[model samples]
Target: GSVGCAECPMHCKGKMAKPTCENEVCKCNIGKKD
Candidate 1:
């Protein structure tokens, strides 16, 4: 199971439905931004 932030509108790149911040909340890896 995984978890994420609800505030994010991207929705974890449509990969994980709901909201799962695998790397960092409000902060993703390089080249990956909204």
Candidate 2:
């Protein structure tokens, strides 16, 4: 599942995280989520 953070309203363009945040707020870990 995809989990967009509340701050998404600010980083709407960063749907896949940026050089700053690799997770949370922007994107969620859908790979090997076991």
Candidate 3:
């Protein structure tokens, strides 16, 4: 199962996709586009 943003300890927002907490770390999957 995937972890929701609310579950994260810090404020997180998704860049290309919804914010996710993986391995207890919060971050987005994709990065800025050139």
Candidate 4:
């Protein structure tokens, strides 16, 4: 199966995690940290 970044709306859902494109697949990256 293939996943898209659009499917992962971490920002809208909350904060920290962010959607990213990796190998044409949906991925998450650290948006914020302390």
Candidate 5:
């Protein structure tokens, strides 16, 4: 199963099609990451 962001340390906004890893480690498209 995919990991849930609700319990993550960062608890980032769980948006669809976006990387929501706990430490912002996941890589996103150039225009995606803030």
Candidate 6:
């Protein structure tokens, strides 16, 4: 999840809608890099 996003991860906030992409497995609300 992201700092302002609430749709992913734990303790989210805005709940941003997750995008569908084959580029990677899962992107954080804030699009954090692994």
Q: Which ten residues in a row have the lowest lDDT in candidate 2?
A: 25-34
**All models: lDDT?**
0.43, 0.37, 0.45, 0.55, 0.39, 0.37
Higher lDDT: candidate 2 or 4?
A: 4
TM-score of 4: 0.40
Residue pairs in collision within model 3? none
Model 1: pairs clashing at backbone N, Cα or C within 3 Å: 3-20, 4-19
As a whole number from 0 to 100, the lDDT of residue 14 in candidate 4 is: 56
Model 4 residue 9 CA deviation (Å) reads 1.9
Which model is ahead, 2 or 3, in terms of lDDT? 3
Measured on C-alpha atoms, candidate 5 has an lDDT of: 0.39
Question: How well does candidate 1 score on lDDT at residue 26?
Answer: 48
Query: How many pairs of residues collide in each model?
Result: 2, 0, 0, 0, 0, 4
Error in Å for residue 22 of model 4: 0.6
Best candidate per TM-score, number? Answer: 4
What CA RMSD would you report for each candidate?
7.5, 8.1, 6.8, 5.8, 7.5, 8.9
* Candidates in descending lDDT order: 4, 3, 1, 5, 6, 2
lDDT string, candidate 2, 1-34, tens digits: 2244434434535444332233452433334221
Worst 10 residues of 6 by lDDT: 1-10
In Å, residue 10's CA in model 6 sits off its true spot by: 2.1
Q: Report the C-alpha lDDT of model 4 over 1-34, residue by residue, as the tens digit.
A: 4356667544335545677766667655665221
Which of the numbered candidates is closest to the native, going by highest lDDT? 4
Name model 6 segments beyond 4 Å from true. 1-8, 16-29
Candidate 3 CA-lDDT value = 0.45
- Per-residue accuracy of model 5 over 1-34 as CA lDDT, tens digit each: 3344323324444453443443534433224433
Model 1, 1-34: lDDT tens digits are: 2223445544345544343355556433344433
Q: Which model, 1 or 2, shows the larger lDDT?
A: 1
Candidate 1 whole-model C-alpha lDDT, 0 to 1? 0.43
Q: lDDT by residue for model 6 over 1-34, one digit each (tens)?
A: 3232332333333555443223333434444523
